[PDB]
Amino acid sequence: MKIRASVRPICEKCRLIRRRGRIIVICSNPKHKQRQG
């Protein structure tokens, strides 16, 4: 997954969930998943 400092939803189906003290994006599109830092 692509990583950045500024993570936000890209499309409507992108959901933002915290896992292990990390803001993470989860979507059906494998491109739109992210991770902060």
Query: Where on the chain is the footprint of Zn ion (CB under 5 A)?
Result: 11, 13-14, 27, 29, 32
Interaction partner, residue 25 (Zn ion, RNA, none; CB < 5-8 Å by kind): none
Q: Is 27 a residue that touches RNA (CB under 7 A)?
A: no
Is-contact 35 5, C-beta < 8 A?
A: no
Q: Is 28 a residue that touches RNA (CB under 7 A)?
A: no
Interaction partner, residue 14 (Zn ion, RNA, none; CB < 5-8 Å by kind): Zn ion
Q: Return all residues near 35 (Cβ < 8 A) that are at least 6 apart.
A: 1, 2, 3, 7, 22, 23, 24, 25
